[PDB]
Design a protein around this motif. Structure first.
Motif, PDB file in Angstrom:
ATOM      1  N   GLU A   1     -33.137  14.423 -18.698  1.00 35.79           N
ATOM      2  CA  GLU A   1     -31.684  14.350 -18.722  1.00 35.79           C
ATOM      3  C   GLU A   1     -31.174  13.000 -18.232  1.00 35.79           C
ATOM      4  OE1 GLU A   1     -29.816  17.808 -17.242  1.00 35.79           O
ATOM      5  OE2 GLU A   1     -27.855  16.873 -16.933  1.00 35.79           O
ATOM      6  N   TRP A   2     -31.662  12.539 -17.084  1.00 32.39           N
ATOM      7  CA  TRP A   2     -31.150  11.319 -16.484  1.00 32.39           C
ATOM      8  C   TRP A   2     -32.073  10.121 -16.642  1.00 32.39           C
ATOM      9  CZ3 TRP A   2     -26.166  11.302 -15.099  1.00 32.39           C
ATOM     10  CH2 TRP A   2     -25.552  12.541 -14.893  1.00 32.39           C
ATOM     11  N   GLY A   3     -33.300  10.323 -17.100  1.00 31.78           N
ATOM     12  CA  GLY A   3     -34.184   9.215 -17.383  1.00 31.78           C
ATOM     13  C   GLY A   3     -34.836   8.619 -16.150  1.00 31.78           C
ATOM     14  N   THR A   4     -35.470   7.469 -16.374  1.00 32.87           N
ATOM     15  CA  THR A   4     -36.283   6.835 -15.344  1.00 32.87           C
ATOM     16  C   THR A   4     -35.458   6.344 -14.160  1.00 32.87           C
ATOM     17  OG1 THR A   4     -37.595   6.103 -17.236  1.00 32.87           O
ATOM     18  CG2 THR A   4     -38.253   5.316 -15.080  1.00 32.87           C
ATOM     19  N   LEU A   5     -34.179   6.025 -14.365  1.00 34.45           N
ATOM     20  CA  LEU A   5     -33.339   5.566 -13.265  1.00 34.45           C
ATOM     21  C   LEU A   5     -33.218   6.603 -12.155  1.00 34.45           C
ATOM     22  CD1 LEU A   5     -31.979   2.998 -12.544  1.00 34.45           C
ATOM     23  CD2 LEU A   5     -29.932   3.725 -13.765  1.00 34.45           C
TER      24      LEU A   5
ATOM     25  N   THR B   1     -35.673   8.442 -11.024  1.00 35.96           N
ATOM     26  CA  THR B   1     -36.965   8.647 -10.394  1.00 35.96           C
ATOM     27  C   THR B   1     -37.023   7.935  -9.048  1.00 35.96           C
ATOM     28  OG1 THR B   1     -37.913   6.723 -11.509  1.00 35.96           O
ATOM     29  CG2 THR B   1     -38.101   8.853 -12.621  1.00 35.96           C
ATOM     30  N   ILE B   2     -37.789   8.509  -8.133  1.00 37.67           N
ATOM     31  CA  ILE B   2     -38.061   7.896  -6.838  1.00 37.67           C
ATOM     32  C   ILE B   2     -39.432   7.232  -6.814  1.00 37.67           C
ATOM     33  CG2 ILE B   2     -38.412   8.364  -4.380  1.00 37.67           C
ATOM     34  CD1 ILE B   2     -36.193  10.366  -4.485  1.00 37.67           C
ATOM     35  N   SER B   3     -40.445   7.916  -7.338  1.00 39.22           N
ATOM     36  CA  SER B   3     -41.806   7.391  -7.410  1.00 39.22           C
ATOM     37  C   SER B   3     -42.486   8.086  -8.575  1.00 39.22           C
ATOM     38  CB  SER B   3     -42.572   7.663  -6.116  1.00 39.22           C
ATOM     39  OG  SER B   3     -41.962   7.021  -5.014  1.00 39.22           O
ATOM     40  N   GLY B   4     -42.830   7.323  -9.605  1.00 34.97           N
ATOM     41  CA  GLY B   4     -43.359   7.912 -10.815  1.00 34.97           C
ATOM     42  C   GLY B   4     -42.323   8.747 -11.529  1.00 34.97           C
ATOM     43  N   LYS B   5     -42.630  10.019 -11.757  1.00 36.01           N
ATOM     44  CA  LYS B   5     -41.701  10.945 -12.382  1.00 36.01           C
ATOM     45  C   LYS B   5     -41.056  11.908 -11.392  1.00 36.01           C
ATOM     46  CE  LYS B   5     -43.866  14.415 -13.153  1.00 36.01           C
ATOM     47  NZ  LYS B   5     -44.748  14.457 -14.352  1.00 36.01           N
TER      48      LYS B   5
ATOM     49  N   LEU C   1     -35.787  14.799 -15.446  1.00 34.61           N
ATOM     50  CA  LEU C   1     -36.182  13.494 -15.965  1.00 34.61           C
ATOM     51  C   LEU C   1     -35.715  13.293 -17.401  1.00 34.61           C
ATOM     52  CD1 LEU C   1     -39.722  11.889 -15.732  1.00 34.61           C
ATOM     53  CD2 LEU C   1     -37.496  10.804 -15.836  1.00 34.61           C
TER      54      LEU C   1
END
Ligand code: CLA
Ligand code: CLA
Ligand code: CLA
Ligand code: CLA
Ligand code: CLA
Ligand code: CLA
Ligand code: CLA
Ligand SMILES: CC(=O)O[C@H]1CC(C)(C)C(=C=C/C(C)=C/C=C/C(C)=C/C=C/C=C(C)/C=C/C=C(\C)C(=O)C[C@@]23O[C@]2(C)C[C@@H](O)CC3(C)C)[C@](C)(O)C1
Ligand SMILES: CC1=C(C#C/C(C)=C/C=C/C(C)=C/C=C/C=C(C)/C=C/C=C(C)/C=C/[C@@]23O[C@]2(C)C[C@@H](O)CC3(C)C)C(C)(C)C[C@H](O)C1
Ligand SMILES: CC1=C(/C=C/C(C)=C/C=C/C(C)=C/C=C/C=C(C)/C=C/C=C(C)/C=C/C2=C(C)CCCC2(C)C)C(C)(C)CCC1
Ligand SMILES: CC1=C(/C=C/C(C)=C/C=C/C(C)=C/C=C/C=C(C)/C=C/C=C(C)/C=C/C2=C(C)CCCC2(C)C)C(C)(C)CCC1
Ligand code: SF4
Lengths: 80, 49, 731, 167, 122, 185, 36
Positions: free
Chosen positions: F66-70, F72-76, F64
């Motif tokens: 490294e690549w950020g919120t984009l 994510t699938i659900s939450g973190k 997370l």
């Protein structure tokens, strides 16, 4: 183009014609009033709709009526 | 295109959300490609109109 | 008709950006479109109505699907008081890690909490599992497809109804009364007895087993033998635990009155009986008019027969049948007026007579529902008057209505408007004066000099319904009254238990603050009505513009002559009245919210004492309750209320931006845009690109509308954020 | 004049006797609003044909040899829907939908109602009298089968007896 | 030179709320929606001026002018009916006497009796 | 036939789109068949690489921070490495396709039938020639007829693979493996 | 494939791709000189 109508209460005072900034109106002969002339709007294609003619008209109610309608370059007063 | 794409990556690489990750440059390049796609859509519909 | 919009030659030939804006704003004014006929107008409206109903059913199916897929409805059902119902999941790549965690409190994934009351309603009507909700969603999705198909089909040449079909009043009214209302109410009673009541008694009745699970052990034998009291015997006891069998009865129709002791909401047997009696009344009503079978009334004859013999109403109601039938705008005005009344009644009755289990404990949901429905009611009332004014401009024929009540309104419009103005001025002067007097005496540290009128008439009404606090021994508060002896036979015990229970909202205790705020509300109603009524009654003309009907419902002005004529059209009256509607509904909802916040906070005395002067409202309602909202994010972090903080600021910004359109007018902007055009034409590498629609400033009326929309959106979003955040962050 | 089926009523003007199976039966006047009876006759034939197949299937899936298989074994027609699975009902739905959408322009068209082309070469060596006789027979079978299907259904969910169980 | 050249535009007057094309036409017969500026050596539209070594200001070069002869000739052409009316009321050669004796603009401006007075001189 | 009536009616209902070759056109059939064939290649490669574990840390999820919120699938909870890798390979192919759509060369088969492109007449001629239920066994080798036939076969295979995987209650990779006689896993 | 993937799949399609194509289509329609 806007619509400009003259109703028969016109007293031929020529004030609307002098008020018009785009020369829409002109005086024409007529036997309906003492002055022997009535207003006319042969060049409504150049009417911007400022209503200075209505402001100038002395009758009650107005004898010249401007109804605003379909806008063109000329009626929108565009220099571009 | 050569003139613009070269400088467009800078703002994304240096100021984008992932600027402090070690894939920040790759994310900046991806953002630049996305911007170029937006601009190309603009050019296309402009030409059509 | 060669360019957009194809429905208007005049607009399609405009060379400016105006062509686009006006096209969008005139797309649904089908009467004004080029070449429109009456028959085509009715057919296109019919198809558009099918489309609108499809949109509604898609929205409902989506709510069901998102709750089923992403909500916690089963957990809420198992434990209503300690669960926060979920609306839908959040997926937002802009969120930080802190935001994801903040919005996933009480859950494993970020969610929005629903404040629509859907969980309480679905729980009350018998929904218990996600599978049932999903099945409902699927059904509504298919129904939306069916409505879209119907809309398409009734535009095909062999299936377009004729104008005579659209103008068949008696048949449409018969079917909408008996079938759309009466039979729908009967079917809803059937659902309540077969499904919802057993669900409340801890029994599953679904599509799997409803044909072989009678809703009453005695079956339909009592119904057919006329021994109907059997369906009222053995109601749920006062110890009945909702959703379980403990303490449950078997009555399916009752007139208990009051609330279920545990849910503090209406008895399901009482609601079933209500809908059964309603079904009878509406089915009977739907047999009044003559369709094809010789019997029934003709509406035209009814109208033409009602003229007072003395003549104080002139020609009476003659001419009104044709006027109503031939005017879609008058029909729409009547519909919007009645809908506005009904929406206000929904808001007023839902908070007091709670219909859904556990709803009175969901404080934020209560506030959101009341505010939502009151604002919608305001919009509907404004619409009703706007369409009345449109009817006067476009549809009213003086000769068809000669000397009838509709024409006589026009005949004494001056008296009507002057008296409405007097009432408005009286209310404003005295209400504002009393508020200011109280403010001043309290500021000088002398609160005993306040003028505090007791709302004696309303307290008497409460006593008449049985409230004992005010010491009025009248009617239902009186042991010896005939009303009491009669009512004790059916519903009075439960009603008296509810009304004299201070934990309910059934006839809240009132005092001087209620008196003053009610007179403020009356001021708002009277002034809004004055603006709307003057707009409708002067829509056709006035001394200042005697030929206004020739210029239409909406037009900018009649120029600077005759002293100046800005905002002279009836549309301008609508525009002015939107501000007063918003202000009035704001006063109403502020009153509701503050009284409930002080009740819920355990200190009604704070409202009772501080609502009597304006500083009390500013300090103890707005300032005090802004606190959790403004701390949704701060230099130290954020919580799940940060979205409401952001929406609060968003609403302030939109409202203020609307001020720009409302205050600054067109000439300034047109002159500025002229220099912008000059700059673009003279800039190298940018003059390679040119507009194909000449940039112009927004029109006079368009700017009024845009300012009004910005004002209204900002008002709504600001208040919604405040009410939700304050209620949810405090309780 | 008067209606043949209900001799004390006036015939609606649309029931001129041209279409097969016309005995002037429309007491509710449902044909007066319609532009023509083509869509109504398409619907009547489609409903009746489906009901014919449905009644035959109700009898066979109750007293007849099922196709080999564990899912296909139950003799209860309502339970068959769930027992055979979505994977088979959906194929049936899609094939029917293909046939329906291919004939869309006939259903909303001006040709002879009911005639989608599946003639079997039966109406080649016939005049119009024999074609009329055949159409009358088909419409009467449709009308009998719709009533029969209503009966069959209401005897299998209101009493839960079989179709051939007359006790 | 055609007199209805202005009227022969593409503006189709609407059936309501539209004064139409008046004495000279509601709008120009030329489509104003033309291309933006163009590279060196190219023209943006049909009659566009070649901006030479500065095509970015090509639109600032004038290809529309009014030479005095065209002005006089269109003055005569557009007022031919008014002059015909004035000779019709005052009464070919007589018009040529009047419009050369005092002028064409003056002939338009004078009155039929006044022109009957100036026709007294020869 | 039903085919000619269908295409004609669709064109009458959507003329603006039907002009460019959108919808039930020969152009769309050709392009979608080309994509279906390439996608059969890609799906087989994915099945083979999953069977042999050639994708590094397939079940591990992306960081997370490294690549950020984009990511994510659900939450973190983040997307796995394998899914991100498959997406990136398809993104290589998609970037090729976008370059071809936006900047076709003069002799190229364009995505849409553009009257201004120098291939428009050739495209209309070819598209007029192709058509029918059975593939032209007279025309073989590298010809438009063979290309159309193989595109149709690939799209049919995709449909049948989805349907068979659904009926058997298994994954599409499992079906692909069991259709090559378990050559991958 | 799982339904739990749908947001991260669908949200960019609804909030970026769909508005862009809808706005481009409306722009092209309003710039069209002969629509009927
Ligand atoms: C308007 C003021 C403003 C500024 C300066 C910024 C700046 C930034 N934003 Mg913010 N933001 C703003 C308002 C602003 N924002 C608003 C109004 C919102 C909506 C509420 C947001 C919501 C937002 C989000 C959600 C995010 C940002 C992010 C960012 C950062 C990256 C943005 C980026 O890469 O763009 C790219 C920029 C360009 C492609 C071009 C920039 C303009 C060029 C340099 C002008 C050059 C002109 C030249 C000098 C002229 C002559 C040249 C020569 C030829 C003569 C950057 C620090 C991102 C971030 O992570 O922040 C740390 C991020 O995720 N912003
Ligand atoms: C019995 C048969 C029947 C039924 C079920 C309907 C049903 C409908 N028709 Mg109607 N229609 C019929 C016969 C019928 N029609 C006939 C015979 C004709 C020709 C004469 C028509 C001609 C017709 C036209 C021209 C139109 C309709 C439309 C409609 C729809 C109205 C919108 C809606 O969905 O709200 C449904 C609403 C409810 C079920 C709830 C209503 C509750 C309201 C708010 C009243 C509540 C009052 C409350 C009970 C008590 C008063 C409150 C007080 C205490 C203060 C609805 C589906 C309209 C439509 O949209 O079609 C697409 C439309 O334009 N119909
Ligand atoms: C006012 C009347 C009314 C209303 C609003 C409801 C509402 C409800 N009922 Mg109730 N019910 C009623 C009367 C009513 N009922 C009556 C008279 C009875 C008999 C006594 C029942 C007996 C009953 C049972 C046994 C159950 C319900 C249930 C429900 C709930 C879910 C229903 C559902 O699945 O929605 C979806 C909508 C539908 C199912 C109907 C529309 C179906 C569409 C039109 C299908 C389209 C057909 C078409 C051919 C499709 C193909 C074409 C198309 C694709 C183009 C919902 C709250 C269920 C529940 O969960 O309770 C908690 C449940 O199990 N009801
Ligand atoms: C049943 C309900 C109903 C129906 C069928 C109609 C139908 C009509 N109305 Mg009426 N009206 C209604 C209710 C209704 N109205 C209500 C409730 C009001 C009070 C507000 C009005 C007040 C009203 C006025 C003042 C006028 C009409 C007019 C009309 C006619 C033209 C509509 C049009 O073309 O605008 C189409 C409008 C649009 C396509 C855009 C609407 C703008 C929306 C609100 C902007 C959305 C807000 C924004 C996006 C939110 C921002 C979000 C934020 C988070 C950023 C049409 C016959 C006009 C007329 O002349 O009739 C003859 C007219 O002048 N109506
Ligand atoms: C809070 C701001 C505010 C206030 C106080 C008012 C007040 C009023 N509005 Mg206005 N209005 C407002 C905002 C406001 N409006 C806005 C934002 C709009 C949208 C443009 C409108 C649009 C509008 C319309 C369309 C109409 C009104 C009308 C009215 C009058 C309603 C009747 C009444 O209450 O009389 C009581 C008077 C008052 C409350 C104002 C007097 C205030 C104090 C008590 C007077 C003190 C005088 C002081 C001693 C002397 C000066 C001291 C020193 C300078 C010498 C009232 C004067 C209506 C009207 O004219 O009705 C008759 C009407 O039709 N308003
Ligand atoms: C279509 C022709 C048809 C035929 C030949 C039958 C034949 C029968 N019906 Mg059925 N029935 C029918 C249609 C038909 N029904 C229809 C249209 C309905 C209304 C839904 C019914 C509703 C019905 C009920 C409620 C019952 C029968 C019963 C019967 C049986 C009793 C014999 C009798 O009729 O006296 C017999 C096998 C009785 C029976 O025992 O069914 C098995 C019975 O109780 N029928
Ligand atoms: C009309 C009601 C409605 C609304 C406002 C929403 C809103 C949302 N949906 Mg939901 N959706 C709905 C109905 C609705 N949905 C229905 C009935 C289904 C079952 C098919 C779904 C299936 C669904 C899935 C699988 C997902 C969403 C998701 C979302 C969220 C992101 C948008 C998105 O990408 O969805 C994409 C939506 C679809 C692919 C199908 C849309 C179907 C509806 C009926 C379209 C509605 C059209 C509408 C009525 C047109 C009028 C609006 C316009 C005039 C302004 C957003 C909260 C995403 C999410 O939850 O992220 C966290 C997500 O992954 N929706
Ligand atoms: C492509 C092509 O061209 O090929 C051609 C070939 C071909 C062959 C020429 C074609 C054809 C013609 C076809 C398909 C003909 C099929 C005809 C069929 C199958 C016709 C009867 C139905 C059932 C009836 C009438 C039942 C009455 C039922 C009654 C009266 C009852 O009481 C029923 C019952 O339930 C209750 C009500 C009460 C219960 O207690 C018990 C019972 C059981 C008694 C086509 C279509 O052209 C296609
Ligand atoms: C007969 C006619 C009827 C019709 C019809 C019927 C049933 C029509 C049938 C339509 C149905 C059967 C059409 C499916 C096509 C298969 C699609 C295109 C496959 C795409 C596959 C390609 C695009 C994708 C490939 C990838 O995804 C893969 C493989 C792996 C990825 O790594 C890479 C890529 C992205 C490349 C009407 C119309 C109803 C009425 C009319 O009157 C009469
Ligand atoms: C302008 C116009 C219009 C509009 C109008 C409107 C908008 C209106 C509104 C109105 C309204 C909005 C009204 C209301 C009313 C109400 C009422 C009238 C009520 C009453 C009530 C009652 C009667 C009650 C009683 C009671 C009871 C029953 C019980 C006990 C208590 C009491 C006593 C209270 C129109 C379209 C028509 C057209 C023309 C023009
Ligand atoms: C790009 C590329 C390439 C190319 C490729 C291609 C060319 C492909 C193709 C592909 C294909 C071409 C595919 C196909 C597939 C198919 C399938 C997979 C099928 C299946 C089907 C089915 C399963 C069937 C079924 C059925 C039916 C439908 C009917 C009858 C019966 C039966 C059962 C038989 C190459 C490699 C060279 C190189 C590299 C790159
Ligand atoms: S219209 Fe009015 S201003 Fe013009 S001449 Fe007649 S009276 Fe005078």
């Amino acid at each position: 183009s806007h619509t400009v109508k003259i109703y028969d209460t016109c007293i031929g005072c020529t004030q609307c014609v002098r008020a018009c900034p785009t020369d829409v109106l002109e005086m024409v002969p007529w036997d309906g009033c003492k002055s022997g002339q009535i207003a006319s709007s042969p060049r409504v294609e150049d009417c911007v709709g400022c209503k200075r003619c209505e402001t100038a008209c002395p009758t009650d109610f107005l004898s010249v009526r401007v109804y605003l309608g379909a806008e063109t370059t000329r009626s929108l007063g565009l220099a571009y | 295109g050569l003139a613009h794409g070269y400088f467009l990556i800078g703002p994304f690489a240096q100021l984008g959300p992932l600027r402090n990750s070690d894939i920040g440059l790759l994310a900046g390049f991806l953002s630049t490609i996305g911007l170029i796609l937006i601009l190309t859509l603009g050019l296309t519909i402009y030409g059509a109109a | 008709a060669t360019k957009f919009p194809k429905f208007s030659q005049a607009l399609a030939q405009d060379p400016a950006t105006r062509r686009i804006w006006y096209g969008i704003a005139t797309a649904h004014d089908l009467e004004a479109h080029d070449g429109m006929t009456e028959e085509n107008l009715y057919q296109k409206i019919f198809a558009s109505h099918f489309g609108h109903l499809a949109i509604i059913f898609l929205w409902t199916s989506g709510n069901l699907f998102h709750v089923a897929w992403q909500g916690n409805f089963e957990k809420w059902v198992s434990n209503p008081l300690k669960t926060r119902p979920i609306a839908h999941s959040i997926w937002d790549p802009h969120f930080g890690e802190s935001a994801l965690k903040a919005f996933s409190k009480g859950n494993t994934y970020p969610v929005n909490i629903t404040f629509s009351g859907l969980y309480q309603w679905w729980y009350t009507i018998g929904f218990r599992t996600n599978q049932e909700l999903y099945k409902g969603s699927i059904g509504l999705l298919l129904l939306a497809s069916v409505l879209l198909i119907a809309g398409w089909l009734h535009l095909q040449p062999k299936f377009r109804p004729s104008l005579s079909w659209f103008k068949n009043n008696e048949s449409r009214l018969n079917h909408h009364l008996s079938g759309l209302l009466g039979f729908s109410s009967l079917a809803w009673t059937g659902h309540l007895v077969h499904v919802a009541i057993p669900a409340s008694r801890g029994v599953h009745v679904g599509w799997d087993n409803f044909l072989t699970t009678p809703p009453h052990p005695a079956g339909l034998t009592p119904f057919f033998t006329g021994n109907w009291t059997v369906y009222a015997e053995n109601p749920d006891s006062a110890t009945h635990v909702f959703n379980t069998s403990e303490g449950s009865g078997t009555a399916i129709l009752t007139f208990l009155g009051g609330f279920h002791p545990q849910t503090q909401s209406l008895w399901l047997s009482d609601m079933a009986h209500h809908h059964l009696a309603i079904a009878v009344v509406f089915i009977v009503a739907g047999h009044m008019y003559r369709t094809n079978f010789g019997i029934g009334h003709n509406m035209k004859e009814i109208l033409d027969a009602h003229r007072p013999p003395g003549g104080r109403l002139g020609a009476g109601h003659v001419g009104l049948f044709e006027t109503i039938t031939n005017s879609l705008h008058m029909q729409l005005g009547l519909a919007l007026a009645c809908l506005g009344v009904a929406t206000s009644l929904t808001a007023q009755h839902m908070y007091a007579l709670t219909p859904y289990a556990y709803l009175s404990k969901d404080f934020t949901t209560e506030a959101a529902l009341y505010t939502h429905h009151q604002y919608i009611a305001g919009f509907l009332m404004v619409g009703a008057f706007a369409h009345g004014a449109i009817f006067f401009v476009r549809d009213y024929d003086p000769e068809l209505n000669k000397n009838n009540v509709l024409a006589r309104m026009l005949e004494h419009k001056e008296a009507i408007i002057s008296h409405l103005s007097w009432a408005s001025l009286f209310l404003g002067f005295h209400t504002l004066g009393l508020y200011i007097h109280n403010d001043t005496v309290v500021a000088f540290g002398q609160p005993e000099k306040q003028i505090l009128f007791e709302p004696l008439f309303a307290e008497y009404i409460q006593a008449a319904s049985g409230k004992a606090v005010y010491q009025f021994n009248v009617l239902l508060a009186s042991s010896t009254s005939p009303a009491t002896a009669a009512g004790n036979q059916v519903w009075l015990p439960g009603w008296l238990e509810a009304i004299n229970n201070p934990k309910t909202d059934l006839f809240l205790k009132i005092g001087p603050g209620d008196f003053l705020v009610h007179h403020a509300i009356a001021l708002g109603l009277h002034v809004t009505a004055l603006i709307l009524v003057k707009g409708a009654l002067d829509a056709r003309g006035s001394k200042l513009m005697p030929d206004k009907k020739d210029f239409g419902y909406s037009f900018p002005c009649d120029g600077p002559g005759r002293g100046g004529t800005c905002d002279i059209s009836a549309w301008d009256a609508f525009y002015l009245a939107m501000f007063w509607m918003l202000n009035t509904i704001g006063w109403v909802t502020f009153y509701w919210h503050w009284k409930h916040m002080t009740i819920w906070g355990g200190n009604p005395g704070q409202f009772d004492e501080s609502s009597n002067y304006i500083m009390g409202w500013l300090r103890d309602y707005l300032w005090l309750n802004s606190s959790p909202l403004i701390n949704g994010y701060n230099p130290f972090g954020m919580n799940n209320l940060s979205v409401w903080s952001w929406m609060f600021l968003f609403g302030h910004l939109i409202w203020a931006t609307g001020f720009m359109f409302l205050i600054s007018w067109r000439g300034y902007w047109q002159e500025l845009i002229e220099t912008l055009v000059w700059a673009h034409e003279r800039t190298p590498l940018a003059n390679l690109i040119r507009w194909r629609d000449k940039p112009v400033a927004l029109s006079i009326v368009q700017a009024r509308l845009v300012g009004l929309v910005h004002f209204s959106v900002g008002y709504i979003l600001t208040y919604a954020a405040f009410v939700i955040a304050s209620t949810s962050g405090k309780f | 004049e008067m209606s043949k089926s209900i001799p004390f009523l006036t015939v609606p003007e649309k029931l001129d006797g041209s279409m097969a199976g016309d005995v002037g039966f429309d007491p509710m006047g449902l044909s007066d609003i319609q532009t023509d009876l083509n869509y109504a006759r398409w619907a009547e034939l489609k409903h009746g044909r489906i009901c014919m197949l449905a009644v035959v299937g109700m009898v066979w899936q109750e007293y007849g040899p099922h196709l080999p298989g564990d899912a296909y074994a139950t003799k209860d027609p309502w339970e068959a829907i769930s027992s055979v699975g979505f994977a088979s009902n959906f194929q049936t739905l899609l094939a029917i939908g293909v046939v329906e959408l291919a004939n869309w322009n006939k259903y909303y068209g001006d040709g002879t109602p009911g005639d989608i082309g599946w003639t079997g070469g039966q109406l080649s060596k016939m005049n119009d009298a024999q074609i009329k006789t055949r159409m009358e027979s088909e419409i009467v079978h449709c009308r009998l089968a719709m009533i029969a299907f209503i009966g069959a259904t209401h005897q299998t969910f209101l009493l839960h007896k079989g179709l051939l169980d007359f006790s | 030179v055609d007199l209805d050249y202005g009227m022969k535009n593409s503006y189709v007057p609407a059936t309501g709320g539209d004064g139409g094309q008046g004495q000279f036409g509601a709008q120009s017969p030329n489509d104003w929606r033309v291309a933006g500026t163009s590279p060196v050596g190219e023209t943006s539209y049909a009659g566009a001026a070649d901006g030479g070594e500065e095509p970015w200001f090509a639109e600032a070069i004038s290809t529309v002018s009014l030479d005095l002869q065209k002005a006089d000739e269109t003055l005569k052409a557009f007022t031919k009916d008014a002059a015909a009316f004035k000779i019709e009321e005052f009464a070919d050669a007589a018009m040529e006497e009047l419009v050369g004796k005092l002028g064409y603009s003056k002939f338009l401006e004078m009155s039929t009796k006044q022109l009957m007075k100036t026709w007294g001189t020869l | 036939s039903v085919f000619d009536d269908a295409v004609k009616d669709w064109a009458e209902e959507y003329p603006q789109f039907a002009a460019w070759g959108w919808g039930p056109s020969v152009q769309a059939e050709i392009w979608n068949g080309r994509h279906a064939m390439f996608g059969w290649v890609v799906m087989c490669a994915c099945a083979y690489a999953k069977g042999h574990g050639l994708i590094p840390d397939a079940d591990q999820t992306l960081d997370l921070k490294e690549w950020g919120t984009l990511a994510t699938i659900s939450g973190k909870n983040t997307i796995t490495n394998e899914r991100a890798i498959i997406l990136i390979a398809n993104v290589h192919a998609l970037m090729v396709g976008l370059a071809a759509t936006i900047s076709p060369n003069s002799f190229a088969d364009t995505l849409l039938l553009d009257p201004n492109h120098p291939m428009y007449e050739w495209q209309m001629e070819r598209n007029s020639k192709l058509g029918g239920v059975m593939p032209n066994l007279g025309k073989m080798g590298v010809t438009p007829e063979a290309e159309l036939a193989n595109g149709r076969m690939a799209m049919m295979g995709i449909i049948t693979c989805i349907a068979y995987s659904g009926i058997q209650g298994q994954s599409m990779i499992d079906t692909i493996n069991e259709w090559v006689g378990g050559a991958y896993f | 494939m799982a339904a739990s993937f749908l947001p991260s799949i669908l949200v960019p399609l609804v909030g970026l791709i769909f508005p862009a194509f809808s706005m481009a289509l409306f722009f092209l329609y309003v710039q069209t000189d002969d629509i009927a």
